[PDB]
mmCIF file with all atom_site columns, C-alpha atoms and ligand atoms in Angstrom:
data_model
loop_
_atom_site.group_PDB
_atom_site.id
_atom_site.type_symbol
_atom_site.label_atom_id
_atom_site.label_alt_id
_atom_site.label_comp_id
_atom_site.label_asym_id
_atom_site.label_entity_id
_atom_site.label_seq_id
_atom_site.pdbx_PDB_ins_code
_atom_site.Cartn_x
_atom_site.Cartn_y
_atom_site.Cartn_z
_atom_site.occupancy
_atom_site.B_iso_or_equiv
_atom_site.pdbx_formal_charge
_atom_site.auth_seq_id
_atom_site.auth_comp_id
_atom_site.auth_asym_id
_atom_site.auth_atom_id
_atom_site.pdbx_PDB_model_num
ATOM   1  C  CA  . UNK A 1 1  ? -1.681  10.504  10.955  1.00 14.49 ? 1  UNK A CA  1
ATOM   2  C  CA  . UNK A 1 2  ? -2.535  7.716   13.390  1.00 13.92 ? 2  UNK A CA  1
ATOM   3  C  CA  . UNK A 1 3  ? -0.397  5.620   11.046  1.00 14.57 ? 3  UNK A CA  1
ATOM   4  C  CA  . UNK A 1 4  ? 2.801   7.674   11.280  1.00 14.17 ? 4  UNK A CA  1
ATOM   5  C  CA  . UNK A 1 5  ? 3.458   8.065   7.624   1.00 14.37 ? 5  UNK A CA  1
ATOM   6  C  CA  . UNK A 1 6  ? 7.057   7.101   7.341   1.00 17.91 ? 6  UNK A CA  1
ATOM   7  C  CA  . UNK A 1 7  ? 6.397   5.510   3.971   1.00 19.37 ? 7  UNK A CA  1
ATOM   8  C  CA  . UNK A 1 8  ? 3.512   7.518   2.385   1.00 18.92 ? 8  UNK A CA  1
ATOM   9  C  CA  . UNK A 1 9  ? 2.319   4.713   0.155   1.00 19.33 ? 9  UNK A CA  1
ATOM   10 C  CA  . UNK A 1 10 ? 0.629   5.617   -3.116  1.00 17.04 ? 10 UNK A CA  1
ATOM   11 C  CA  . UNK A 1 11 ? -1.923  3.004   -4.230  1.00 19.80 ? 11 UNK A CA  1
ATOM   12 C  CA  . UNK A 1 12 ? -4.091  3.336   -7.345  1.00 18.09 ? 12 UNK A CA  1
ATOM   13 C  CA  . UNK A 1 13 ? -7.765  2.906   -6.616  1.00 16.69 ? 13 UNK A CA  1
ATOM   14 C  CA  . UNK A 1 14 ? -8.684  5.098   -9.574  1.00 17.38 ? 14 UNK A CA  1
ATOM   15 C  CA  . UNK A 1 15 ? -11.574 4.496   -11.946 1.00 17.14 ? 15 UNK A CA  1
ATOM   16 C  CA  . UNK A 1 16 ? -9.725  2.547   -14.635 1.00 20.85 ? 16 UNK A CA  1
ATOM   17 C  CA  . UNK A 1 17 ? -7.510  0.362   -12.455 1.00 21.79 ? 17 UNK A CA  1
ATOM   18 C  CA  . UNK A 1 18 ? -10.282 -0.165  -9.839  1.00 21.95 ? 18 UNK A CA  1
ATOM   19 C  CA  . UNK A 1 19 ? -12.601 -1.735  -12.434 1.00 22.78 ? 19 UNK A CA  1
ATOM   20 C  CA  . UNK A 1 20 ? -10.180 -4.633  -12.933 1.00 24.58 ? 20 UNK A CA  1
ATOM   21 C  CA  . UNK A 1 21 ? -11.299 -5.869  -9.511  1.00 27.10 ? 21 UNK A CA  1
ATOM   22 C  CA  . UNK A 1 22 ? -8.220  -4.539  -7.790  1.00 24.03 ? 22 UNK A CA  1
ATOM   23 C  CA  . UNK A 1 23 ? -10.244 -3.393  -4.808  1.00 23.49 ? 23 UNK A CA  1
ATOM   24 C  CA  . UNK A 1 24 ? -10.608 -6.848  -3.293  1.00 25.73 ? 24 UNK A CA  1
ATOM   25 C  CA  . UNK A 1 25 ? -6.933  -7.517  -3.685  1.00 26.88 ? 25 UNK A CA  1
ATOM   26 C  CA  . UNK A 1 26 ? -6.033  -4.099  -2.240  1.00 23.08 ? 26 UNK A CA  1
ATOM   27 C  CA  . UNK A 1 27 ? -8.484  -5.065  0.518   1.00 24.14 ? 27 UNK A CA  1
ATOM   28 C  CA  . UNK A 1 28 ? -6.051  -7.808  1.354   1.00 20.67 ? 28 UNK A CA  1
ATOM   29 C  CA  . UNK A 1 29 ? -3.487  -5.049  1.765   1.00 17.66 ? 29 UNK A CA  1
ATOM   30 C  CA  . UNK A 1 30 ? -5.870  -3.063  3.923   1.00 16.21 ? 30 UNK A CA  1
ATOM   31 C  CA  . UNK A 1 31 ? -5.965  -5.936  6.373   1.00 16.71 ? 31 UNK A CA  1
ATOM   32 C  CA  . UNK A 1 32 ? -2.319  -6.629  5.706   1.00 17.74 ? 32 UNK A CA  1
ATOM   33 C  CA  . UNK A 1 33 ? -1.573  -3.400  7.576   1.00 19.45 ? 33 UNK A CA  1
ATOM   34 C  CA  . UNK A 1 34 ? -3.026  -5.423  10.417  1.00 20.17 ? 34 UNK A CA  1
ATOM   35 C  CA  . UNK A 1 35 ? -1.625  -2.701  12.590  1.00 23.91 ? 35 UNK A CA  1
ATOM   36 C  CA  . UNK A 1 36 ? -0.984  -2.640  16.292  1.00 25.60 ? 36 UNK A CA  1
ATOM   37 C  CA  . UNK A 1 37 ? -2.126  0.724   17.539  1.00 27.95 ? 37 UNK A CA  1
ATOM   38 C  CA  . UNK A 1 38 ? -0.834  2.778   14.710  1.00 31.10 ? 38 UNK A CA  1
ATOM   39 C  CA  . UNK A 1 39 ? 0.767   0.443   12.269  1.00 29.04 ? 39 UNK A CA  1
ATOM   40 C  CA  . UNK A 1 40 ? 1.786   -3.043  11.439  1.00 26.10 ? 40 UNK A CA  1
ATOM   41 C  CA  . UNK A 1 41 ? 4.703   -3.054  13.761  1.00 25.81 ? 41 UNK A CA  1
ATOM   42 C  CA  . UNK A 1 42 ? 3.851   -0.209  15.971  1.00 30.19 ? 42 UNK A CA  1
ATOM   43 C  CA  . UNK A 1 43 ? 5.435   2.436   13.856  1.00 27.53 ? 43 UNK A CA  1
ATOM   44 C  CA  . UNK A 1 44 ? 3.513   3.988   11.063  1.00 24.58 ? 44 UNK A CA  1
ATOM   45 C  CA  . UNK A 1 45 ? 5.303   2.400   8.187   1.00 27.55 ? 45 UNK A CA  1
ATOM   46 C  CA  . UNK A 1 46 ? 2.158   2.694   6.161   1.00 26.89 ? 46 UNK A CA  1
ATOM   47 C  CA  . UNK A 1 47 ? 0.716   6.004   5.029   1.00 26.44 ? 47 UNK A CA  1
ATOM   48 C  CA  . UNK A 1 48 ? -1.491  4.814   2.197   1.00 25.21 ? 48 UNK A CA  1
ATOM   49 C  CA  . UNK A 1 49 ? -3.219  7.204   -0.124  1.00 21.33 ? 49 UNK A CA  1
ATOM   50 C  CA  . UNK A 1 50 ? -4.329  7.136   -3.736  1.00 21.53 ? 50 UNK A CA  1
ATOM   51 C  CA  . UNK A 1 51 ? -3.564  10.750  -4.507  1.00 21.32 ? 51 UNK A CA  1
ATOM   52 C  CA  . UNK A 1 52 ? 0.026   10.545  -5.830  1.00 17.76 ? 52 UNK A CA  1
ATOM   53 C  CA  . UNK A 1 53 ? -0.572  7.279   -7.691  1.00 17.33 ? 53 UNK A CA  1
ATOM   54 C  CA  . UNK A 1 54 ? -3.158  6.939   -10.516 1.00 18.62 ? 54 UNK A CA  1
ATOM   55 C  CA  . UNK A 1 55 ? -0.749  9.151   -12.355 1.00 18.17 ? 55 UNK A CA  1
ATOM   56 C  CA  . UNK A 1 56 ? -0.023  7.489   -15.705 1.00 18.98 ? 56 UNK A CA  1
ATOM   57 C  CA  . UNK A 1 57 ? 2.033   4.562   -14.396 1.00 19.16 ? 57 UNK A CA  1
ATOM   58 C  CA  . UNK A 1 58 ? 0.271   1.244   -14.974 1.00 19.93 ? 58 UNK A CA  1
ATOM   59 C  CA  . UNK A 1 59 ? 2.355   0.029   -17.959 1.00 20.40 ? 59 UNK A CA  1
ATOM   60 C  CA  . UNK A 1 60 ? 4.904   -0.598  -15.233 1.00 23.28 ? 60 UNK A CA  1
ATOM   61 C  CA  . UNK A 1 61 ? 3.960   -2.117  -11.878 1.00 20.73 ? 61 UNK A CA  1
ATOM   62 C  CA  . UNK A 1 62 ? 4.048   0.809   -9.453  1.00 23.07 ? 62 UNK A CA  1
ATOM   63 C  CA  . UNK A 1 63 ? 3.735   0.628   -5.707  1.00 26.17 ? 63 UNK A CA  1
ATOM   64 C  CA  . UNK A 1 64 ? 4.980   3.471   -3.622  1.00 28.22 ? 64 UNK A CA  1
ATOM   65 C  CA  . UNK A 1 65 ? 5.640   3.641   0.049   1.00 27.59 ? 65 UNK A CA  1
ATOM   66 C  CA  . UNK A 1 66 ? 7.194   6.947   0.913   1.00 29.15 ? 66 UNK A CA  1
ATOM   67 C  CA  . UNK A 1 67 ? 10.639  7.448   -0.432  1.00 29.39 ? 67 UNK A CA  1
ATOM   68 C  CA  . UNK A 1 68 ? 10.771  3.648   -0.424  1.00 31.70 ? 68 UNK A CA  1
ATOM   69 C  CA  . UNK A 1 69 ? 8.627   2.732   -3.465  1.00 29.99 ? 69 UNK A CA  1
ATOM   70 C  CA  . UNK A 1 70 ? 7.696   -0.987  -3.130  1.00 26.61 ? 70 UNK A CA  1
ATOM   71 C  CA  . UNK A 1 71 ? 5.421   -3.632  -4.596  1.00 23.94 ? 71 UNK A CA  1
ATOM   72 C  CA  . UNK A 1 72 ? 2.873   -4.238  -1.818  1.00 24.31 ? 72 UNK A CA  1
ATOM   73 C  CA  . UNK A 1 73 ? -0.383  -3.390  -3.582  1.00 26.05 ? 73 UNK A CA  1
ATOM   74 C  CA  . UNK A 1 74 ? -3.137  -5.734  -4.528  1.00 27.91 ? 74 UNK A CA  1
ATOM   75 C  CA  . UNK A 1 75 ? -2.536  -8.764  -6.853  1.00 30.79 ? 75 UNK A CA  1
ATOM   76 C  CA  . UNK A 1 76 ? -0.974  -11.332 -4.533  1.00 30.17 ? 76 UNK A CA  1
ATOM   77 C  CA  . UNK A 1 77 ? 2.164   -9.243  -4.214  1.00 31.19 ? 77 UNK A CA  1
ATOM   78 C  CA  . UNK A 1 78 ? 0.746   -8.006  -1.038  1.00 32.92 ? 78 UNK A CA  1
ATOM   79 C  CA  . UNK A 1 79 ? 1.491   -10.902 1.267   1.00 30.44 ? 79 UNK A CA  1
ATOM   80 C  CA  . UNK A 1 80 ? 5.116   -11.178 0.394   1.00 33.59 ? 80 UNK A CA  1
ATOM   81 C  CA  . UNK A 1 81 ? 5.796   -7.557  -0.035  1.00 33.23 ? 81 UNK A CA  1
ATOM   82 C  CA  . UNK A 1 82 ? 4.084   -7.151  3.330   1.00 30.59 ? 82 UNK A CA  1
ATOM   83 C  CA  . UNK A 1 83 ? 7.229   -8.634  4.804   1.00 29.68 ? 83 UNK A CA  1
ATOM   84 C  CA  . UNK A 1 84 ? 8.707   -5.654  3.000   1.00 28.55 ? 84 UNK A CA  1
ATOM   85 C  CA  . UNK A 1 85 ? 6.211   -3.189  4.485   1.00 27.13 ? 85 UNK A CA  1
HETATM 86 S  S1  . FES B 2 .  ? -3.801  4.912   -12.742 1.00 28.79 ? 1  FES B S1  1
HETATM 87 FE FE1 . FES B 2 .  ? -3.504  2.829   -12.101 1.00 28.79 ? 1  FES B FE1 1
HETATM 88 S  S2  . FES B 2 .  ? -1.167  3.103   -11.608 1.00 28.79 ? 1  FES B S2  1
HETATM 89 FE FE2 . FES B 2 .  ? -0.717  5.228   -11.184 1.00 28.79 ? 1  FES B FE2 1
#
């Protein structure tokens, strides 16, 4: 909402995936938003929520941002894919 939500990003923080210590790496992402007043590059590129993701996906790498579907999640991919976000 404050972050526009151009790319509604779906990030798994579910029970199974979360236990693998993904939280700290997604935390990187959290700060990777780094925002402005709304988002990253005052827009609202990010609209992160779990709810879509955690849907039977993990045997591929999934990262969704809106109708964009990227790879900026948790395990290091964040920083580089942040240039993408
Ligand atoms: S349950 Fe971890 S990826 Fe959609």
